[PDB]
Amino acid sequence: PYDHKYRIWEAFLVVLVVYTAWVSPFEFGFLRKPRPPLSITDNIVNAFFAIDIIMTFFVGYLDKSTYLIVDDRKQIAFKYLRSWFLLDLVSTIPSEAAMRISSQSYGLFNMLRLWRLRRVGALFARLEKDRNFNYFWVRCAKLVCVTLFAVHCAACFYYLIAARNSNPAKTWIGANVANFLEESLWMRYVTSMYWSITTLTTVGYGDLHPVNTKEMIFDIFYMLFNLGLTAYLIGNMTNLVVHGTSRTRNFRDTIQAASNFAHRNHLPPRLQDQMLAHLCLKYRTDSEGLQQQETLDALPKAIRSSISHFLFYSLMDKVYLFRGVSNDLLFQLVSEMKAEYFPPKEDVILQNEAPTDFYILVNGTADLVDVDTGTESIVREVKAGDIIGEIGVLCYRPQLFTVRTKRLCQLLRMNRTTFLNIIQANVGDGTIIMNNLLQHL
């Protein structure tokens, strides 16, 4: 059904398909009777496909209407036996019997083995529906394969309607090569493949062109096919390019109509620096994760408060504040804390302001740079899991010292309004103020 070994086996019958896709057209076009170097290998493959004819009874048959995989040993045997049985059965009949019953069939008969190509289509369907597989490398491969297969079948058919012509001189290949029936199959195959790819790519040199009316009609239909095939290829390549670059094109519009916003205004260039230094950083921490906000917020608050509890909980309980407090108050306020990132050498809380917010560090570091009338001096080294500026907001005195990030680090914002609206809902104010005035020791 879904077993590990099974999936490996099915992915092994596929390289055997890729083998048949090349060999069956090749024996159609280029060969008249089984030859040892090939009539021994396509018997092996027939055995490996007859084996899967019996092993496809002991499989876990799955229905979509009912999500249960039918493990019955007898209801699978009556569904597979319905649709793909005589097809998969006749497809593995060795050509040595089809010749015994009737000669002059070896070519058209073993073209039935193209029936084992549903496996490739099924594998590609599974690949694109998957999510661990780059859609680029799964779509830009179904096209390469169908193109190579078209080129190959066209080569073999166009050589076949040349080998069977009653006079080999008035053919598309006998016009260049005098006696092409006395040349290595390698050379004939290369000439045919070369013609077919020159006419599919619309180069069309002019050597190797139709010479009589049968080749002309085949070529008319082949070129009609190629017209649509190439339009389809260009469509899919445009679709790949459009989505492949859709990210940079968006960051560019962001920067564009965020400089514009500074032009339909007069902002001093200093803050027009921090803005573009924060917007770019916001794009380097989104192509890498850690700040996928406009996804995280589109979730329900009953999950968006379960994530931000799995990350910042075992961090917040180690603050010197929140020493003794009911776990539920923690889980409650940690739910509401907007995490933001900051470039290095950035002043988050510049000294002598209104004590509005207070942050908690999770990464990076900074220091409490102490600025007097004129001086710049630092006495601290804050680390992961430490508060800043909270003394100001829990006493409504102006901020004590500047803070300048000395790296790139992410903090947790929690405004004073929400904090006071939360703290009153419980009585932990006592323990909080206790620990806080205890901090002065």
């Binding site: 999510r131 859609y135 006419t199 619309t202 180069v203 069309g204 040199y205 002019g206 062109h209 139709p210 009316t213 002309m216 009609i217 070529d219 008319i220 070129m223 009609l224 190629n226 017209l227 649509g228 339009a231 389809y232 260009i234 469509g235 899919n236 445009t238 679709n239 459009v242 989505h243 890498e288 994760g289 850690l290 996928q292 996804t295 995280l296 589109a298 979730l299 329900p300 608050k301 009953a302 999950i303 379960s306 994530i307 799995f310 990350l311 539920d328 889980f331 409650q332 809902a425 419980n426």
Partner: protein, 474 residues
């Protein structure tokens, strides 16, 4: 009945035995047994378009089967030319079905279509063969069967009415229409170039006379094959180089042909590009959402229990954002929208806990003015402390009752289909003292506070203290 039948199914509908528009000695233009006949005529057009160019260029098809074949096509097209007298027609500016023979006649004749069709249907070459002894010749007389290209308007109408029917794929129909116009132009160019080569003096300086000397003596299908082959290799821009232009007439026609071909092929590539790009516009948008979720949950180390709680959710968001596009009746006239709304919501509405005992006037003034919304299984419709502009009457799914508290929250009550919610605030005018979040993909009916109240205390006067009675019961 309806104006929808005539303008929507591409092949018309089945006429049953007693249609009110049916009349004696009239067939309706939207009937199936007519829009199937007028497709048989399009199948015949597909042959007449081919044959007209063919025997224009090749000039020896007449002395054979094609001359008697396009008479039994110049008959089916002469049958229709009189059948279109008993055929109704949708009148613009009064979307009726004009069904008086006099008016149908007067609209048909006064149009160019009648004279053009009576021209296109005239078998002039058989006329020549019967008056004289044979067609015989002509460098220009064969231009007469170019009139039959007038019939090509029927294929235009067909492709025009297949691209409004939404049962057929829209860009796919355009690609088949483009394919038909292409293989018609390949045919036209092949026959024109053969015509140019056939009437050129000194025939060994043509494009075909250089390769095959006696091309004027070979079966017309050898010439036709060569011409189709040439026009295909220059349409597709392969250009092997055998069969190139030799004299000035061919050079001129050929560089007009392959000048228009640039635009034709760029058009085809544009159509296929738009097909492919639009067909895969939503699958990617859904995939680009599962992608960043996995990226975010893998960069960090969230357990894969709360990583299939975000994947098994955004599916619901896609579904609910799709279900509010099936809202179409936001523009239809009120007199009809208030009937769909009636049939859908009158049951749910009238047997609600508060609306009980209301007169039908206010009931209809309500049902006509409501519109429904959908909600994912975990969003909260109304949370506490808001001023109460709205109150909801849920029709499907459920909604859970919670309030504000020091602790996170408490689950008080579960509400089933046909129950009100958030009405305490909107009634008592005090801010909403409750919070309500959904627990399944649910549908709701919202009521504006201002409009509801002004409606209840102003429109009708027979409403007093029974809403209080029921209100008190809760």
């Amino acid at each position: 009945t309806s104006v929808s039948s005539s303008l929507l199914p591409a092949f018309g509908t089945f006429i049953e035995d007693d249609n009110p528009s049916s009349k004696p000695f009239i067939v309706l233009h939207f009937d199936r047994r007519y829009r199937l006949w007028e497709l048989f005529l399009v199948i015949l057009v597909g042959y007449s378009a081919w044959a007209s160019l063919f025997e224009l260029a090749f000039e020896k098809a007449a002395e054979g089967a094609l001359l008697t074949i396009d008479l039994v096509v110049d008959f089916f097209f002469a049958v229709d030319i009189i059948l279109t007298f008993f055929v109704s027609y949708l009148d613009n500016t009064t979307y009726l079905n004009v069904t008086d023979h006099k008016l149908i006649a007067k609209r048909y004749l006064k149009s160019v279509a009648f004279v053009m069709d009576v021209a296109s249907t005239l078998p002039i070459q058989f006329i020549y063969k019967t008056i004289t002894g044979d067609v015989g010749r002509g460098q220009a007389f064969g231009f007469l069967n170019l009139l039959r290209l007038w019939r090509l308007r029927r294929v235009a109408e067909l492709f025009k009415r297949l691209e409004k029917d939404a049962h057929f794929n829209y860009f796919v129909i355009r690609v088949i229409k483009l394919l038909c116009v292409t293989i018609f132009w390949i045919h036209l160019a092949g026959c024109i170039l053969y015509w140019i080569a056939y009437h050129y003096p000194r025939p060994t300086d043509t494009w075909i006379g250089s390769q095959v000397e006696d091309f004027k003596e070979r079966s017309v299908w050898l010439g036709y094959t060569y011409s189709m082959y040439w026009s295909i290799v220059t349409l597709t821009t392969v250009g092997y180089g055998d069969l190139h232009a030799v004299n000035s007439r061919e050079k001129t026609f050929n560089m007009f042909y392959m000048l228009f071909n640039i635009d034709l092929t760029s058009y085809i590539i544009g159509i296929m590009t738009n097909l492919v790009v639009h067909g895969a516009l939503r699958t990617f948008a859904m995939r680009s959402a599962i992608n960043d979720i996995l990226r975010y949950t893998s960069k960090n180390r969230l357990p894969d229990t709360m990583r299939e709680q975000m994947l098994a959710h955004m599916q619901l968001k896609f579904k609910t954002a799709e279900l509010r596009q099936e809202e179409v009746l936001q523009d239809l006239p009120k007199a009809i929208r208030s009937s769909i709304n009636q049939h859908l919501f009158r049951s749910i509405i009238e047997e609600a806990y508060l609306f009980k005992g209301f007169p039908e006037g206010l009931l209809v003034q309500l049902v006509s003015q409501i519109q429904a919304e959908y909600f994912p299984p975990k969003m909260e419709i109304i949370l506490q402390n808001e001023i109460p502009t709205d109150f909801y009457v849920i029709v499907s799914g459920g909604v859970d009752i919670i309030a504000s508290k020091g602790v996170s929250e408490q689950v008080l009550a579960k509400l089933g289909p046909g129950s009100m919610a958030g009405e305490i605030g909107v009634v008592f005018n005090i801010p909403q003292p409750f919070t309500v979040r959904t627990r399944r993909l649910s549908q709701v009916i919202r009521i504006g506070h201002h409009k509801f109240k002004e409606m209840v205390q102003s429109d009708n006067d027979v409403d007093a203290k029974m809403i209080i009675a029921n209100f008190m019961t809760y």
